[PDB]
Automatic annotation (TrEMBL), chain A:
<protein>
    <recommendedName>
        <fullName>Histone-lysine N-methyltransferase, H3 lysine-36 specific</fullName>
    </recommendedName>
</protein>
From TrEMBL, chain B:
<comment type="function">
    <text>Plays a role in maintenance of chromatin structure during RNA polymerase II transcription elongation thereby repressing transcription initiation from cryptic promoters. Mediates the reassembly of nucleosomes onto the promoters of at least a selected set of genes during repression; the nucleosome reassembly is essential for transcriptional repression.</text>
</comment>
<comment type="function">
    <text>Histone H3-H4 chaperone that plays a role in maintenance of chromatin structure during RNA polymerase II transcription elongation thereby repressing transcription initiation from cryptic promoters. Mediates the reassembly of nucleosomes onto the promoters of at least a selected set of genes during repression; the nucleosome reassembly is essential for transcriptional repression. Essential for viability.</text>
</comment>
<feature type="coiled-coil region">
    <location>
        <begin position="87"/>
        <end position="104"/>
    </location>
</feature>
<protein>
    <recommendedName>
        <fullName>Transcription elongation factor Spt6</fullName>
    </recommendedName>
</protein>
<comment type="similarity">
    <text>Belongs to the SPT6 family.</text>
</comment>
């Protein structure tokens, strides 16, 4: 199984 | 949130980008149990982002969390997976979510 993409957030 | 009417029907976002806008809204609210195929959780997330039940101090809604999103990486991944040029569409969705049907 792949990994579901999660949008990176600013830091 | 699961009703017949839709939040995004009062915005300029095309119906083909409704799942894109709901994925933006769900990822902005730091949800992690979300799966792309679950439309119900997407609708709940966007409903709680645009019409929260307990808004914070001096904030009408949780639309301000959209400014932390990195739209460039999302557009890059969209172009890689689906061969879609949607970089301006993410910006349009963000602006419409922050203020539904502005006076342009």
């Amino acid at each position: 199984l792949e990994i579901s993409y999660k949008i990176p957030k600013s830091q | 949130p699961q009703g017949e009417m839709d939040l995004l029907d009062s915005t300029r976002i095309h119906p083909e980008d409704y799942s894109l806008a709901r994925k933006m809204a769900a990822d902005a609210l730091d949800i992690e149990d979300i799966d792309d195929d679950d439309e119900s959780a997407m609708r709940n997330a966007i409903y709680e982002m645009v019409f929260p039940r307990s808004p914070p101090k001096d904030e009408d809604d949780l639309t301000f969390k959209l400014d932390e999103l990195i739209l460039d990486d999302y557009a890059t991944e969209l172009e890689r997976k689906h061969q879609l040029k949607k970089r301006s569409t993410l910006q349009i969705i963000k602006e419409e979510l922050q203020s539904r049907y502005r006076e342009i």
